[PDB]
């Protein structure tokens, strides 16, 4: 996402930036979301939604 950076990066661009690439980065992402998905973590960001 564009978070405190200009542009956001193509999932491939991201792989080369870490040397462990591809489907790999595509999974780290999903688990991280999954992580922020449930509670303790979930509570706060939830409230921004209408």
């Amino acid at each position: 996402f564009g978070i405190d950076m200009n542009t956001d990066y193509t999932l491939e661009e991201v792989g080369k930036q870490f040397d462990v690439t591809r489907e790999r980065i595509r999974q780290i992402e999903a688990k991280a979301l999954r992580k922020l998905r449930h509670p303790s973590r979930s509570e706060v960001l939830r409230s921004f939604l209408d």
């Binding site: 998905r37 449930h38 509670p39 303790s40 979930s42 509570e43």
Partner: protein, 319 residues
């Protein structure tokens, strides 16, 4: 080193009106119990009176039944004063039915073992066209004092029945109270006093019943008055919720299909703190859930941000 009063003749003089008298009274207590009884009689007395009403072919107070000469807003305002009395029950739904060019009184209702129509001449409305016809579900509860219609929606949560016209609740059978203590000498006592408490009912509280439950409150109030324990409350509640509050809401909120809505009634799952922790495993084995039946649950859990089946080594804490 004191005396204590009691009630001699209770003298009815109308269904509506009666003088109850209290003889052994000491100097000044006359006006003391007397004012303080008028005070607890005009307010705090029990009463039942019609609360809601659904009428045949009418949607809101501001309309017109065909073939009646009142308007729905007026018909409600006739029931507000419909004087009923009931016993073992707390809310009883009487039914009204009648046709043909003819004044529909209170007597035209149907009776329940508890229903006593303390005034059967009481006009409710007039029909006026041979085969013009009305029918209604009048609903009576019984409470204390004055619950105006409006405040009776904060409990909402599906009072949807468009038909149900709520009427302002005037729950009380005191019309007007008046004591006067004239002096009364029991043959020997220097000067004791009388207390004639004249009262005006709607017909549905028998003077003695009243004046008693009146004195009763005064006691329970003065009860806390006697000793004074400076009493207080614990307070300082909790500012530590573990989970996301979303898991303390019922499964309705999921806004789901009816066959999937009652099915979580079934397998013992109200709050979504239980749906959150029951896997796909758990679900074919549940009465009546399938491909179309459970595809549905993985999609409304997706939209709100939760998933099916996970854990939480602590559910649910703690009050």
């Amino acid at each position: 080193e004191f005396l204590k009063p009691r009630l001699v003749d209770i003298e009815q003089v109308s269904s509506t009106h009666a003088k109850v008298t209290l003889e052994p009274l000491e100097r000044g207590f006359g006006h003391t119990l007397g004012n303080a009884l008028r005070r607890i009689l005009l307010s705090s007395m029990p009463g039942c009176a019609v609360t809601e009403v659904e009428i045949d072919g009418v949607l809101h107070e501001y309309s017109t039944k065909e073939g009646v000469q009142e308007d729905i807003l007026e018909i409600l305002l006739n029931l507000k004063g419909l004087a009923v009395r009931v016993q073992g029950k707390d809310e009883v739904i009487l039914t009204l039915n009648k046709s043909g060019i003819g004044p529909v009184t209170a007597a035209d209702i149907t009776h329940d073992g508890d229903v006593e129509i303390v005034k059967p001449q009481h006009v409710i409305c007039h029909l006026t066209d041979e085969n013009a016809s009305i029918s209604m579900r009048i609903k009576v509860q019984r409470g204390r004092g004055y619950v105006p219609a409006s405040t009776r929606i904060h409990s909402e949560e599906d009072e949807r029945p468009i038909g149900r016209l709520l009427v302002d609740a005037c729950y009380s059978p005191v019309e007007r109270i008046a004591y006067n203590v004239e002096a009364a000498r029991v043959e020997q006592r220097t000067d004791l006093d009388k207390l004639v408490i004249e009262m005006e009912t709607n017909g549905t509280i028998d003077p003695e019943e009243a004046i008693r439950r009146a004195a009763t409150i005064l006691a329970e109030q003065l009860e806390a008055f006697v000793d004074l324990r400076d009493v207080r409350q614990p307070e300082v509640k909790e500012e530590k919720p573990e989970f996301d509050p979303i898991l303390l809401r019922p499964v309705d909120d999921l806004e789901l299909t009816v066959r999937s809505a009652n099915c979580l009634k079934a397998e013992a799952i109200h709050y979504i703190g239980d749906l959150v922790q029951r896997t796909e495993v758990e679900l074919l084995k549940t009465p009546n859930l399938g491909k179309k039946s459970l595809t549905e649950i993985k999609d409304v859990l997706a939209s709100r941000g939760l998933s099916l089946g996970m854990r939480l080594e602590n559910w649910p804490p703690a009050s």
